Each structure stands twice: as structure tokens, then as C-alpha cells.
Design a protein around this ligand. Structure first.
Ligand SMILES: CC(=O)OC[C@H](NCc1c(COP(=O)(O)O)cnc(C)c1O)C(=O)O
Length: 382
């Protein structure tokens, strides 16, 4: 029998660790889930289900229910694209678009692009962890309270916006080398902003954020470590690739993307590999000495990418290559992607060249719009 999952979302604040994820892998692999006699007594299974994009739980004794009956596949978008609030627009205004590139790759590698700039607040994939995180604070953190984090830019803009929609004030911390929008848009959205012109990176900022949190009592939401990040991509980004492939009738063979927190690629890799372990995951490694906005090398220490049972393949990419791929994509598709998108595309194109890859459809995740990167565009034009 089917029940509305929303009555059981206390399990999100309750359940700790990664054990539940074996329930999620199992249900995804099987296409079904067993009826729960006493749903309350199985917080971890319930959590696994929410995590996969279900809106109903199976309830009763003996039966089971399909991913479809569970709502993994519900259409959320109103056909007329009319939303009663910005938040509902974030929620229901999904999936982001999966678009086939006109770009040709060797060895029968067919590229689609998932355009994450189609999120309303930061015009980036960071909208998703910002909503999911803040949403959870919402129940036990007092309105009016200040929340804060290190950001490369995207996260901070997104967070600043979502926090205000929720009653919170916001503070964002950025390295000197971050984009100017990251430093300026939060203020517009009414957050405070701190720029450390010294910090050679986002992560380098975490110590001062933590200390400051201890001192000032603000809540440090920590995207780098907060599981509402990966869970947000599991139920959004990753479910969507799954659903978009099955329904777009793609013969899905792999995904490609970049890594900052590592949240979205981890979810996409995890979720899809549960459905078929042969699904590849091609990941970018900014060539050492190079900086590609929003992303970094794998061994700089990332939570989920390392900690979960995920198969993946690294490729290096310079700033110069990532940009040449912005230009390639701009000229084929008339889509202006950002540097991490460029890199992700290039990583996919390198692996294509080596003949590493089973030929088929490959979904590349584009984190944001190239519009935000005009002086790198300027540099890439020489
Ligand atoms: C350095 C860092 O991790 O910045 C994190 C946020 N940017 C995310 C981001 C990514 C990577 O997605 P994820 O963090 O692995 O899930 C890729 N490209 C861009 C342009 C991004 O902004 C942040 O903004 O703080």
C-alpha cells in the first residue's frame, strides 16, 4: 500500500551514517522495494527511499512496490511552467534540461549536456545543496539566526538567496581569486561577504570559518561535509539523469563531471552504478598548478567521492583546455557553458580518444553558464 513519504521526513534529522545507502542501492538495482509493516521502525529504509526520489513509501505486510508506484518517476513540472513562489519553482521546476550536443566525439561517444544553470537562484548546480541544507536547518534552527560557509562563489550566492527565503541571515567567505559575482551577488541578496585575498582556495578558508563559528555562534552549514549536499543530488541531479535517460530512450553508458565538494558527481556516479555497475564516471582533475573555478584535484580531500562504493576514472585538464572546450561547445551548440563544464566535456573527449569507453550516450553535467566568466572567455580568445 502506498503512503506519502512527507509524514516520515523526521528520519532525515534522525538517521546517521551511510548504512542506509545499501537499501538505496538494493531498491535501485531491483526496481522494487518491499512493503514495510511498521515504517516507523525502519528509519533507514525510509531514508534510502527519500534519497532515491520516492514520494511514497510501501506500507503493509508481504507486498512490494515498483520505483514507479513509489514516485521515482513522477512528473513534477507543470506543463505551463507557472509557479506560485520562487521556492516551489526550484522544487517543481525540474528536471534541468538534458540536451544532445551537436559535437562529435571519436569512437561513437554521444554527448548530452545537463544544464545546471537552469536553477533559479545561483544559475548553477549549487542551488540544490543550498535548498536541501537550509530546508533541514529550518526545523531546529531559529529564524533570524545567521548561517555561513566557504564558497568558490556559486554556493554562497545560492545560500544567500535560500537563507533569506527561509528567514535566516547569511555570511559568505571567499578566496581572493574567486569570480566577482560571488563577492558581489550575496551583498545584493543581503548576505555579508568576507574576502580573504590571501586564501589560495576555498578549503583553505574552512579553519577561519570554524573558529569564527565558535566565536560568533553562527551555524556553519559546511557543504564540504554536510550530507544534505549528496542527498540533494541523489534525489535531484542523479535521479534525473536516470529518469531522463530511461525516458529520453538513451542507451546510457556513462557520466562525466567535475568535483568541488564532490557532492553531485558522487551522487550521479552512485545512483547510476546501482542501476548498472558498468556505467562509467569520467571525472576531471584540474592539471596541477591550474585552477578551474569551482573545482579542484581529488586528493585535496573530498568526502563522498572517496567514502562510498563508486567506480570512477580521472582525466587531467588544463585551464587552457577547459576553455578551448567552452569555445568548441559555444561554436557547435550556441550554448555558453562555464569552465568546469568545459573541463568535464574535455575529460569526456580525452577518454573518448583513448578508446577507453563503450560507445553510447554519455551525460556531461554542466555546473553553470559561461556568462559568469567573461575575463576567462577574453583570455581564451587570446
Ligand atoms: C571549491 C569548491 O568545492 O566549491 C564548491 C562550490 N562550487 C560547486 C561547483 C562545482 C562542483 O560541484 P560539487 O561541489 O562537486 O558538487 C563545479 N563547478 C562549479 C562552477 C561550481 O560552483 C561553491 O560554489 O562553493
Amino acid at each position: 500500500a502506498l503512503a506519502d513519504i512527507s509524514g516520515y521526513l523526521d528520519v532525515l534529522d534522525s538517521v546517521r551514517g551511510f548504512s542506509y545507502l545499501e537499501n538505496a542501492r538494493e531498491v535501485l538495482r531491483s526496481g522494487e522495494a518491499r512493503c514495510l509493516g511498521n515504517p516507523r521502525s525502519e528509519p533507514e529504509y525510509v531514508k534510502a527511499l527519500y534519497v532515491i526520489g520516492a514520494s511514497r513509501i510501501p506500507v503493509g505486510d508481504g507486498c512490494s512496490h515498483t520505483l514507479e508506484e513509489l514516485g521515482v518517476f513522477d512528473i513534477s513540472v507543470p506543463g505551463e511552467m507557472v509557479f506560485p513562489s520562487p521556492l516551489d519553482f526550484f522544487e517543481r521546476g525540474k528536471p534541468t534540461p538534458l540536451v544532445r550536443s551537436r559535437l562529435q566525439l571519436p569512437n561513437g561517444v554521444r554527448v548530452w549536456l545537463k544544464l545546471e544553470w537552469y536553477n533559479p537562484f545561483s544559475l548553477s548546480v549549487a542551488d540544490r545543496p543550498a535548498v536541501e541544507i537550509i530546508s533541514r536547518l529550518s526545523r531546529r534552527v531559529e529564524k533570524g539566526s545567521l548561517v555561513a560557509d566557504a564558497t568558490s562563489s556559486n554556493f554562497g550566492v545560492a545560500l544567500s538567496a535560500v537563507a533569506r527565503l527561509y528567514g535566516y541571515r547569511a555570511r559568505v567567505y571567499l578566496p581572493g581569486a574567486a569570480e566577482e559575482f560571488g563577492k558581489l551577488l550575496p551583498r545584493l541578496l543581503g548576505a555579508q561577504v568576507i574576502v580573504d585575498p590571501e586564501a589560495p582556495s576555498t578549503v583553505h578558508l574552512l579553519p577561519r570559518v570554524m573558529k569564527d563559528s565558535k566565536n560568533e555562534g553562527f551555524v556553519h552549514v559546511n557543504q564540504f561535509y554536510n550530507d544534505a549536499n549528496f542527498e540533494a543530488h541523489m534525489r535531484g541531479t542523479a535521479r534525473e539523469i536516470f529518469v531522463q535517460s530511461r525516458r529520453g530512450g538513451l542507451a546510457l553508458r556513462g557520466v562525466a563531471g567535475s568535483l568541488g565538494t564532490s557532492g553531485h558527481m558522487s551522487a550521479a556516479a552512485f545512483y547510476l552504478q546501482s542501476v548498472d555497475p558498468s556505467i562509467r564516471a569520467v571525472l576531471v582533475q584540474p592539471a596541477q598548478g591550474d585552477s578551474i573555478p569551482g573545482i579542484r584535484r581529488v586528493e585535496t580531500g573530498m568526502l563522498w567521492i572517496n567514502m562510498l562504493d563508486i567506480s570512477y576514472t580521472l582525466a587531467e585538464v588544463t585551464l587552457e583546455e577547459a576553455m578551448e572546450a567552452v569555445v568548441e561547445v559555444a561554436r557547435s551548440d550556441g550554448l555558453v557553458i562555464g569552465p568546469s563544464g568545459g573541463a568535464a566535456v574535455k575529460a569526456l573527449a580525452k577518454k573518448a580518444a583513448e578508446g577507453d569507453l563503450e560507445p553510447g550516450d554519455y551525460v556531461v553535467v554542466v555546473p553553470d553558464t559561461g556568462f559568469k566568466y567573461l575575463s576567462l572567455v577574453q583570455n581564451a580568445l587570446e
